[PDB]
Scaffold this active site. Structure first.
Site, PDB file in Angstrom:
ATOM      1  N   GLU D  59      -8.649  -1.907  23.433  1.00  0.00           N
ATOM      2  CA  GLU D  59      -9.430  -2.209  24.388  1.00  0.00           C
ATOM      3  C   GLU D  59      -9.630  -3.767  24.501  1.00  0.00           C
ATOM      4  O   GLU D  59      -9.745  -4.513  25.474  1.00  0.00           O
ATOM      5  CB  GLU D  59     -10.486  -1.334  24.731  1.00  0.00           C
ATOM      6  CG  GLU D  59     -11.063  -1.330  25.805  1.00  0.00           C
ATOM      7  CD  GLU D  59     -12.492  -0.774  26.210  1.00  0.00           C
ATOM      8  OE1 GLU D  59     -12.654   0.375  25.633  1.00  0.00           O
ATOM      9  OE2 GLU D  59     -13.457  -1.612  26.706  1.00  0.00           O
ATOM     10  N   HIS D  60     -10.143  -4.308  23.166  1.00  0.00           N
ATOM     11  CA  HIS D  60     -10.496  -5.541  22.995  1.00  0.00           C
ATOM     12  C   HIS D  60      -9.315  -6.569  23.246  1.00  0.00           C
ATOM     13  O   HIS D  60      -9.515  -7.753  23.784  1.00  0.00           O
ATOM     14  CB  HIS D  60     -11.088  -5.826  21.452  1.00  0.00           C
ATOM     15  CG  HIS D  60     -12.521  -5.199  21.453  1.00  0.00           C
ATOM     16  ND1 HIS D  60     -13.234  -6.229  21.088  1.00  0.00           N
ATOM     17  CD2 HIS D  60     -13.111  -4.034  21.633  1.00  0.00           C
ATOM     18  CE1 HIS D  60     -14.609  -5.532  20.916  1.00  0.00           C
ATOM     19  NE2 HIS D  60     -14.380  -4.443  21.238  1.00  0.00           N
ATOM     20  N   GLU D 136     -20.365  -5.765  17.891  1.00  0.00           N
ATOM     21  CA  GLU D 136     -20.510  -4.865  18.729  1.00  0.00           C
ATOM     22  C   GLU D 136     -21.430  -3.579  18.174  1.00  0.00           C
ATOM     23  O   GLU D 136     -22.283  -3.062  18.734  1.00  0.00           O
ATOM     24  CB  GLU D 136     -19.465  -4.491  19.805  1.00  0.00           C
ATOM     25  CG  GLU D 136     -19.035  -5.543  20.625  1.00  0.00           C
ATOM     26  CD  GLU D 136     -17.747  -5.215  21.541  1.00  0.00           C
ATOM     27  OE1 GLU D 136     -17.074  -4.168  21.705  1.00  0.00           O
ATOM     28  OE2 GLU D 136     -17.652  -6.015  22.337  1.00  0.00           O
TER      29      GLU D 136
END
Ligand SMILES: Cc1c(-c2ccc(Cc3ccc(OC(F)(F)F)cc3)cc2)[nH]c2ccccc2c1=O
Lengths: 74, 379, 413, 445, 46, 196, 59, 99, 65, 239
Positions: D59-60, D136
């Site tokens: 996703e990153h 994160e």
């Protein structure tokens, strides 16, 4: 003092299972028997001595009382 | 709110004392004895009240009324033997209870502890007057000897004794009043026991490690409600095993021939749970000396906290102390044996030695043991 | 079906697209925002916003709550500096129950002493929560710094006034601001005939200063290791053509992320700042626009020690836009962004209601989206450089929050 | 012109399929703006322990360049056409989508395709996004809601892949190589696992075509040996109690096992959940609120907030509540909340079920407003149910539920069942499991 | 009708920021709005 | 991260029904609860059994003792009371009268004008065998013992306040409010009467 | 078919009201069964010794 | 010196180390100890809290740690000494002042 | 009429423990009954005998009843 | 004063769950009746007590009828004498203790109601006394009527050996050996002192069984509830 005001605790997680997910007697004899033995050894030389001594003072004294109540051969 | 448990003025008290009460996670089976003592107390009261519905405290009828219970009243026997073995179970439960307190240092809770000492004294007074009520030999003769000891007291001693008696010997008044005191006292015990817990719940319980437990408290319900039921169940097994398979085991035969102020029984002695202090009385040759030793053999309990030297609270981590304690126990078991024997050789000497060992352990050896242990930890 | 529109003789606008959806949104919009508070009743409108669902003449406080809930309904009250917006949603079959409620709340609140007293603490809670977002500190401060009056007014009631907003102030505020001349009644999923008829019968109520820009600065010292900071100059008023210039300038410079976890490679400001300083940061063009006035500038979020470098870097980027550096490809990007943004904002039946009612107050009637995109196209590269030019030479307002030890003052910039 | 009716003439959803098996779904209206993207049956439930949080790692990387548009070319191009590019990973579903001018739907769909299929995954871009996940992970540590829910899962589905967090353990983030990422991708991102969904102004026909144009290279070939199948997941009645007295407020999250995506009982449960409801201290309602949990919590400041949830996974889920409260209130929160479960189970009223119905009717009608919600409803529904359920169908299941149903259904899941509990913070008061468990039945029923 | 996105606890410690990737999307761009509701948690917008 | 927390292995502690990590616990939920509640339920039945017995005994104790029951009844040999004679016995510490009534007295009490009686109670409503009337020798006025074969009705006369009774034991004259009391009795044979 | 403990649960032990009715019924039966069966065990252990056993010789 | 023979023996016999307790964990809390504990830093408090929590839980289970896990005699740092010493030294001072 | 008791008392009497104890009985029998001016008696020896006899008698007598 | 304690004879009721032999009691009753009733008393047993134990109701009535007992007054103010009922107790030999001493050369015969309970050793002791009567050991001169019994305290008793072979004929025709007569009377003196014996032991067995059920059940209930805590694992995860 009520739950909620007992003491300060930080960074300790506790995981636990419901009683209905687990058994009442996990490894009851397998683990039970050795743990009893461990426990028995750990205190026997502190607990048992005095009662041994009682047993002796008692059995000595009892039959000394019986013996002394017999007639003496003289 | 809506938790009536916490809301209602009455239920609040129960919720706080039996349900949501923070109890340590780790309390052992030695902590069951409080609960069990409570049950013993209720037990005595029910059985007691039921016996009192059929008994009479007149010296002439008294023995007969008790046998009348055991022959002609429906289940009167199981009630009577339950009440008498119940008195035994009371003392076993008491001694284990106090033992726990000594070994684990619970007596640091001073008000709780002293109230304990009062409770003990009261149950003793109760059980002393109870054993008289059947009016058998050992009842009557036991009662004459013990009471009389008070006469040792300079001047007033001799008057005081005849004042208890209400006459010049253990007779009518003595029994009738012993009935009344015996009836009312349990109720006072009830009260004092509530004061006992009133103090307890200010700190909550000690635990076997002796180390403060507020990091690992659990609510009394269900953990200790379930254990108490189990405990009580084991108590009822002990009681009923005696009552249904060996009811006479713990008492004395002479208490089945009526009280006769002529015929003196061979070796008069109180019930088993006094025998240790009976022996201590008999150690000391002088009568007022022996009264003050029997007095000190119980009251010394209120001294125990002052004598505490260890930097650690419990004996768990304290080997010397453990040993001396188990010594003190066995010594007490020896005093019990010695107290049941005739005053003759070799028992006289054994007794003397045991009585010395008792006070020596409490007043001198166990405090020392504490300090050595300390010095060994560089405490 | 497309939108209908009415303006009664009493001044009130009704606008309503019957779209036959299963859901019905009705909104009553009122020129009763924070700006119409004076220095005597500061915070009244904030209490007034918390204060729907308090007893009315026609419905109890209990009934407003229970009744709306019964039908799965929702009542909300939104405030800017200039307006307040009372909105009801419900399944379409229950519009007239919610409408009953809407009317009661806005045209006949009782504001009972005990209820109003009871509700005071909500001011502290409400404000407290709100001020957890640091952007709320800085924007509220910014306005206070930039204006001498009206638009300076915080939306959240000032601490001193909490516990002190009176029933009478609430009455006065409603009586003097909630009027036909000041209200637009907007609708989806409802016939215009019966909205009009409701507005005539139930929203006929008899009617009742210019915001002077000042330029100042305000600096909350608080020791976070991030410094929020916003620098602005007077921008053009909403409704003016120049304002479109500002909107475009905003989108040239960069006004928000398009790609998640992205680097914003087309954002002029972001790149200007990212070249100077590498650690966690963020910057956006800031663009507000009101009836009297507007603020245009930028908002930085920087590490405490780099706040100096970041604000200067950002300001510098605006200076080169104002000097003249600006290619059509950039302004095309900006317009496309803005154009896309506008259409997207009115994509939900929620955002649409806000635009219809929003315009209804600040302008004569509904401008269709098509006309608006045309007006964005109507901005020349010339107008964008003027907007930037205006900003660089305009008198400044500033606001910061954080550990401000390396945050420059306006005069330091 | 009624509600019943309004439902009848809501746009239908177009359903189509490619050779490879990519489903294409569309709902259309006269709209200048749209949303389109790819929903994938992929997430943490599909990951093992060694490659946990790969899906998240990707996703990153997803928006960070492609072979056809390397580096910031992809970013720039989305930006300059005014489009909004976005992604999300759950334990079961990944999704990347784009908000765009209706006119730019073609390039939209081209770009999506460029991201999925031809994802760069540059060496240095991996090592950069490596630190980012770690940070994160750290911020997430300071979100108590986040933590408590991660824990509810971890203990609820302990010793399974559902116990796994989406983000993965830091150990993995630190060690996952580019090799692991590309392997994960080819195994999970396949046409029959994927759905292309779009809403706004678009003729369906155009989308299907465009699907073909760019998503044709997508493989649908799981060899017999290695067909990703979701082994059921065992729920366990359990507690995880992270006690950290240093934090200002306690988070508690408690759930029974729910039925999972498929089951119609989900509808009646949603009704019941809406009865009990949700709350926080910002709400207008106070004492007058309809839900007894809400009115009681409000009048007596028990909690700062709470919500009921009902999270669905494949053939299982978490049906419960999360609350945030004072350290002295955990007992009283837990007592009223459990109280409420029992009252519905045993003795729900009609009027209150009618309320629940109306809430849920309202809920899912006004949720589906604008293109992104609707696009997503299409995308996810196709993965979960295998089809979009029309609003009028939802309404038919809702009308079906009465008091009797709410009782029966709730009893099935709640009454005398083992919950999973997670608490975090100053939770010294948070009730003992046995006490919580005994709180799941009435000795009066 | 629906619950809000981030619920609101007062007195509850703030969520941290430790990178650029979380920060972007924070810098304010339009003036303030405040909604209060009957159902939905009260929030503050640009 | 908190994401590095994993729940320990509970396999050692688990029931076998829930050991299988890839299967649903919901199968065994019906069952595991069943086994556990059975223990509870069984236990209660056990304790019910006990408490019943304990309570039952204690209640029993307060019911009449064996010795009280032993003075409950009386055995009177009927063939030892000749015709006409009133024999008194001691029963419940009370005098108990058992009278052999002659052929004459049977007919006389049967013919008695019943509506003249202060206390009705017809003769046949006060006896089982007409030749035998059994009554407590306790006068209903102030508790004296009536003397056999005296008074105006040739039955009983109490000298305390002048109570005259007939051969059915009924009040006919004096202050006594009720007829002499009829005890519970039965005849166990032709010779034997058990009163009590 | 689910197991016997499970049958017992769903039929008798879920509703607390049925749980209690079960207990009282089961106790009634347990009582007599246990009384009868244990009395057997006592009387066999003491065969011929009890009045119940030697009753017949004097009737 | 030469009594270090007994010390090391006593230590193992005493046996609190089998619960992973250090000596000062076992100190009975009077008012001086309470204050000393109250004056411990985060690290040292949290450790004490844990070690006791650990020990108490072991007590409840009627078990001990593995021998590897036992507190080694030498590794038993006397953590509470500095704080306790001064708590006491302080009290003795105000006691003196009260004459 | 034979008493089973006096039967068994005989049977038991011929055991080593018994026969040794009655010898103890007989030594002092014809020690005190031979000597004069000796207040010492011999119950103790009879009791030694009876103890060991009657222990055995017990183990077996009830058989006959 | 040496002491010889009785040996422990294997009675029909020695064991845990062993009842009294009721046929033995019926004989033993008669050994009180024909032999001791003359010297000893048994105040706590009445004719009724025998019913359902060793005699039928009717048999016990006949046994009762066979004896005189005083009753009264009658209304004249006289104490009469009458036939015994079931409600009459076994009647005392003498009018008082002083009269009983006169009859037995200074010794008061103890009441036998509780004699098994009131003497250490119980039926073992009484049986040894009754059958243990022997000629003095050499060296020994007991005083007047102070017969020699090795089991009595002080070894000298003022009771003539009361039992010998055929000291009565038994109702059921058992050969009345001295040993058999002593066994039976002891069996009855057991029951005299403890009529509950059989019922008590019944209760014993039912209690052992119930406890057998409940102890492991409740123990399992305990372990169940407690298993929450027993299983739990702890983790200290400091920052
Ligand atoms: C309170 C307490 C107990 C505990 C004590 C007694 C009982 C049984 C019982 C005894 C007397 C009663 O009479 C009364 F109160 F009702 F008036 C009632 C019940 C049960 C429990 N046990 C403890 C065990 C460990 C630690 C603390 C306690 C405790 O606080």
């Amino acid at each position: 003092r009520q739950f909620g005001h007992l003491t300060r605790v930080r960074h300790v997680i506790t995981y636990s299972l419901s009683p209905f997910e687990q058994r009442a007697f996990p490894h009851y004899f397998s683990k039970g028997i050795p743990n009893v033995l461990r426990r028995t050894r750990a205190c026997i030389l502190r607990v048992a001595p005095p009662f041994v001594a009682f047993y002796l003072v008692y059995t000595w004294g009892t039959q000394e009382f019986e013996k002394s109540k017999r007639k003496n051969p003289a | 709110m809506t938790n009536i448990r916490k809301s209602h003025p009455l239920m609040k008290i129960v919720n706080n004392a039996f349900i949501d009460l923070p109890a340590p996670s780790n309390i052992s089976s030695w902590w069951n004895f409080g609960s069990l003592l409570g049950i013993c107390l209720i037990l005595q009261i029910l059985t007691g009240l039921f016996l009192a519905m059929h008994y009479t405290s007149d010296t002439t009828t008294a023995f007969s009324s008790v046998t009348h219970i055991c022959r002609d009243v429906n289940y009167g026997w199981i009630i009577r033997y339950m009440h008498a073995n119940g008195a035994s179970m009371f003392f076993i439960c008491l001694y284990m209870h106090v033992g726990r307190g000594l070994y684990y240092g619970s007596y640091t809770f001073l008000e709780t502890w002293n109230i304990g000492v009062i409770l003990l004294l009261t149950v003793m007074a109760t059980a002393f007057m109870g054993y008289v009520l059947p009016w058998g030999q050992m009842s009557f003769w036991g009662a004459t000897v013990i009471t009389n000891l008070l006469s040792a007291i300079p001047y007033i001693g001799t008057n005081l004794v005849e004042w208890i008696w209400g006459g010049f010997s253990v007779d009518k008044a003595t029994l009738t009043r012993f009935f009344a005191f015996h009836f009312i006292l349990p109720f006072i015990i009830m009260a004092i026991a509530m004061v006992h817990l009133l103090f307890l719940h200010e700190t909550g319980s000690n635990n076997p490690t002796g180390i403060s437990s507020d990091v690992d408290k659990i609510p009394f319900h269900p953990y200790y409600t379930i254990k108490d039921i189990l405990g009580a169940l084991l108590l009822i097994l002990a009681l009923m095993l005696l009552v249904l398979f060996a009811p006479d085991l713990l008492g004395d035969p002479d208490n089945y021939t009526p009280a006769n102020p002529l015929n003196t029984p061979p070796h008069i002695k109180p019930e088993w749970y006094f025998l240790f202090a009976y022996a201590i009385l008999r150690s000391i040759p002088n009568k007022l000396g022996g009264v003050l030793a029997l007095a000190f053999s119980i009251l010394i309990l209120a001294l125990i906290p002052l004598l505490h030297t260890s930097k650690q609270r419990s004996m768990m981590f304290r080997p010397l102390s453990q040993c001396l304690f188990w010594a003190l126990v066995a010594d007490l078991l020896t005093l019990t044996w010695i107290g049941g024997q005739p005053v003759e050789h070799p028992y006289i000497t054994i007794g003397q030695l045991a009585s010395v060992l008792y006070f020596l352990l409490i007043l001198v050896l166990m405090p020392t043991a504490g300090t050595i242990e300390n010095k060994l930890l560089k405490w | 079906q497309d939108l209908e529109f009415t303006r009664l003789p009493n001044g009130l606008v009704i606008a309503s697209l019957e779209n036959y959806a299963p859901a019905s949104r009705i909104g009553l919009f009122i020129k009763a925002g924070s700006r119409y508070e004076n220095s005597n009743n500061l915070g009244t409108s904030h209490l007034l916003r918390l204060a729907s669902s308090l007893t009315t003449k026609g419905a109890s406080s209990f009934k407003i709550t229970r009744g709306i809930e019964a039908v799965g309904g929702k009542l909300s009250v939104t405030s800017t500096r200039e307006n307040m917006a009372y909105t009801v949603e419900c399944l379409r079959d229950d519009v007239d129950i919610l409408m009953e409620f809407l009317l009661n709340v806005t045209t006949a609140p009782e504001f009972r002493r005990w209820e109003v007293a009871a509700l005071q603490p909500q001011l502290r809670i409400d404000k407290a929560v709100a001020l957890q977002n640091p952007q709320a500190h800085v924007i509220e401060n910014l306005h206070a710094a930039a204006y001498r009056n009206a638009l300076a007014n915080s939306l959240y009631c000032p601490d001193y006034r909490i516990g002190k907003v009176t029933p009478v102030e609430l009455h006065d505020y409603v009586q003097n601001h909630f009027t036909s001349a000041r209200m637009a009644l907007i609708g989806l999923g409802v016939s215009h005939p019966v909205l009009k008829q409701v507005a005539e019968q139930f929203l006929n109520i008899r009617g009742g200063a210019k915001a002077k820009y000042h330029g100042g600065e305000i600096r909350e010292q608080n020791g976070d290791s991030l410094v929020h900071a916003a620098l602005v100059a007077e921008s053009a008023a909403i409704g003016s053509a120049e304002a479109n210039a500002f909107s475009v300038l905003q989108h040239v410079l960069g006004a928000g992320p398009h790609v998640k976890r992205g680097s914003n490679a087309t954002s002029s400001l972001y790149q200007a700042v990212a070249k100077g300083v590498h650690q966690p940061f963020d910057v956006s063009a800031f663009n507000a626009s009101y009836s009297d006035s507007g603020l245009f500038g930028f908002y930085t979020i920087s590490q405490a020690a780099s706040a100096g470098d970041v604000i200067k870097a950002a300001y510098n980027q605006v200076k080169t836009i104002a000097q003249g550096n600006l290619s059509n490809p950039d302004v095309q990007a900006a317009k496309n962004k803005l154009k896309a943004g506008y259409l997207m904002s009115v994509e939900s039946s929620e955002g649409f209601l806000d635009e219809v009612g929003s315009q209804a107050l600040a302008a004569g009637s509904y401008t269709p989206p098509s006309t608006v995109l045309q007006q964005i196209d109507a901005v020349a590269d010339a107008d964008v450089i003027n907007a930037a030019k205006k900003f660089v030479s305009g008198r400044k307002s500033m606001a910061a929050s954080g550990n401000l030890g390396h945050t420059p003052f306006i005069d330091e910039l | 012109a009624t509600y019943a009716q309004a439902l009848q003439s809501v746009p239908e959803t177009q359903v189509s399929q490619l050779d490879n098996g990519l489903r294409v779904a569309s709902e259309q209206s006269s709209q200048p703006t749209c949303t389109v993207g790819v929903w994938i049956d992929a997430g943490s439930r599909y990951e093992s322990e060694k490659n946990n949080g790969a899906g998240y790692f990707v996703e990153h990387l997803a928006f960070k360049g492609t072979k056809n548009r390397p580096g910031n070319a992809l970013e720039k191009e989305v930006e300059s056409m005014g489009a909004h590019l976005n992604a999300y990973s759950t334990r079961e579903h990944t999704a990347y989508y784009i908000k765009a001018l209706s006119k730019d739907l073609p390039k939209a769909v081209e770009l999506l395709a460029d991201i999925v299929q031809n994802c760069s995954l540059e060496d240095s871009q991996i090592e950069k996004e490596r630190d980012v996940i770690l940070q994160e992970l750290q911020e997430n540590d300071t979100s108590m809601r986040d933590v408590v829910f991660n824990y509810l899962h971890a203990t609820a589905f302990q010793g399974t892949p559902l116990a796994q967090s989406v983000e993965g353990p830091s150990e993995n983030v630190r060690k996952l190589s580019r090799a692991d990422l590309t392997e994960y991708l080819s195994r999970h991102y396949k046409a029959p696992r994927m759905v292309l969904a779009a809403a706004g102004g678009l003729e369906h026909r155009q989308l299907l075509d465009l699907a073909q144009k760019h998503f044709s290279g997508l493989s649908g070939t799981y060899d017999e040996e290695t067909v990703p199948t979701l082994s059921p997941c065992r729920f366990t009645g359990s507690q995880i109690c992270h006690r950290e007295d240093g934090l200002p407020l306690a988070h508690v999250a408690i759930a029974v096992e729910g039925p999972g995506w498929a089951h119609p009982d989900n509808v009646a449960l949603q009704v019941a959940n809406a009865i009990i409801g949700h709350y926080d201290c910002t709400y207008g309602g106070g004492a007058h609120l309809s839900s007894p949990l809400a009115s009681i919590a409000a009048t007596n400041k028990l909690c700062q907030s709470f919500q009921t949830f009902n999270i669905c996974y494949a053939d299982t889920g978490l049906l419960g509540a999360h609350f945030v409260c004072d350290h002295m209130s955990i007992d009283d929160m837990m007592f009223v909340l459990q109280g409420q479960w029992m009252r519905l189970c045993t003795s729900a009223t009609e009027s209150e079920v009618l309320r629940g119905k109306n809430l849920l009717r309202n809920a899912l009608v006004s949720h589906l407003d604008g293109t992104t919600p609707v696009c997503e409803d299409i995308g996810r529904s196709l993965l979960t149910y295998g089809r979009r359920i029309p609003l009028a169908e939802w309404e038919s299941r809702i009308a079906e539920v009465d008091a009797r149903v709410v009782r029966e259904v709730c009893s099935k899941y709640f009454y005398d069942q083992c919950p999973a509990v997670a608490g975090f913070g100053p939770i010294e008061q948070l009730p003992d499991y046995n006490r919580i468990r005994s709180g799941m039945f009435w000795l009066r029923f | 009708a629906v619950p809000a996105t981030s619920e609101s606890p007062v007195l509850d410690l703030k969520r941290s920021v430790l990178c650029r990737e979380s920060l972007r999307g924070q810098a304010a761009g339009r003036p303030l709005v405040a909604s209060v509701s009957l159902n939905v948690p009260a929030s503050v917008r640009y | 991260s908190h994401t590095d927390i994993k729940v320990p292995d509970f396999s050692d502690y688990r029931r076998p029904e829930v050991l299988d990590s890839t299967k649903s616990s919901k199968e065994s939920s019906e069952a595991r609860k069943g086994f556990s509640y059975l223990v509870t339920a069984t236990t209660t039945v056990g304790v019910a059994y006990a408490a019943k017995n304990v309570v039952s005994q204690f209640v029993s104790s307060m019911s009449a003792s064996a010795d009280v029951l032993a003075m409950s009844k009386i055995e009177i040999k009927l063939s030892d009371i000749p015709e006409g004679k009133n024999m008194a016995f001691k029963w419940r510490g009370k005098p108990l009268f058992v009278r052999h009534r002659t052929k004459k007295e049977i007919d006389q009490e049967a013919a008695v004008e019943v509506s003249q009686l202060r206390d009705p109670q017809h003769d046949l409503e006060r006896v089982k065998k007409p030749e035998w009337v059994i009554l407590i020798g306790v006068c209903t006025h102030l508790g004296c013992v009536p003397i056999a074969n005296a008074g105006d009705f040739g039955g009983y006369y109490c000298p305390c306040h002048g109570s005259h009774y007939d051969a059915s034991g009924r009040i006919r004259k004096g202050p006594a409010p009720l007829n002499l009391e009829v005890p519970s009795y039965e005849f166990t044979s032709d010779d034997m009467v058990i009163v009590g | 078919a689910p197991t016997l403990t499970a049958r017992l649960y769903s039929l008798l032990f879920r509703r607390t009201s049925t749980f209690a009715l079960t207990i009282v019924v089961g106790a009634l039966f347990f009582e007599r069964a246990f009384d009868q069966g244990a009395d057997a065990i006592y009387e066999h252990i003491n065969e011929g010794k009890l009045w119940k056993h030697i009753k017949h010789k004097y009737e | 010196r030469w009594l270090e023979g007994i010390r090391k023996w006593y230590y193992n016999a005493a046996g609190f180390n089998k619960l992973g307790l250090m000596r000062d964990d076992t100190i009975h809390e009077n008012d001086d100890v309470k204050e000393a504990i109250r004056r411990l830093p985060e690290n040292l408090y949290d450790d004490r809290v844990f070690r006791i929590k650990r020990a108490l839980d072991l007590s409840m289970r009627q078990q001990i740690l593995p021998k590897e896990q036992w507190t080694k005699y030498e590794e038993d740092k006397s953590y509470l000494e500095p704080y306790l010493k001064e708590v006491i030294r302080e009290r003795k001072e105000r006691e003196e002042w009260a004459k | 009429l034979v008493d089973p008791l006096t039967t068994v008392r005989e049977q038991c009497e011929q055991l080593e423990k018994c026969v040794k104890a009655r010898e103890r009985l007989e030594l002092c029998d014809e020690r005190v009954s031979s000597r004069s001016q000796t207040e010492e008696d011999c119950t103790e020896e009879l009791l030694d005998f009876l103890h060991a006899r009657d222990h055995c008698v017990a183990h077996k007598l009830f058989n006959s009843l | 004063d040496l002491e010889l304690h009785p040996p422990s004879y294997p009675w029909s009721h020695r064991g845990l769950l062993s009842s009294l032999d009721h046929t033995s009691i019926r004989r033993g009753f008669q050994v009180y009746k024909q032999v001791c009733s003359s010297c000893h008393s048994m105040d706590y047993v009445a004719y009724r007590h025998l019913v359902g134990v060793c005699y039928t109701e009717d048999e016990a009535k006949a046994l009762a009828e066979e004896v005189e007992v005083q009753d009264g007054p009658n209304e004249d103010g006289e104490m009469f004498m009458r036939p015994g009922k079931l409600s009459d107790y076994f009647p005392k030999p003498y009018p008082n203790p002083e009269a009983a001493r006169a009859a037995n050369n200074g010794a008061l015969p103890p009441d036998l109601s509780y004699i098994v309970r009131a003497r250490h050793g119980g039926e073992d002791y009484v049986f040894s006394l009754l059958t243990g009567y022997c000629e003095p050991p050499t060296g020994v001169s007991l005083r007047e009527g102070l017969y020699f019994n090795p089991y009595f305290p002080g070894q000298a008793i003022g009771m003539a050996p009361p039992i010998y072979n055929e000291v009565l004929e038994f109702d059921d025709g058992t050969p009345a050996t001295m040993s058999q007569v002593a066994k039976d009377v002891c069996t009855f003196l057991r029951w005299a002192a403890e009529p509950e014996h059989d019922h008590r032991k019944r209760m014993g067995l039912k209690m052992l069984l119930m406890m057998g059920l409940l102890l492991p059940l409740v123990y399992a209930m305990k372990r169940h509830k407690w298993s929450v805590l027993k299983s739990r694992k702890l983790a200290y995860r400091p920052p």
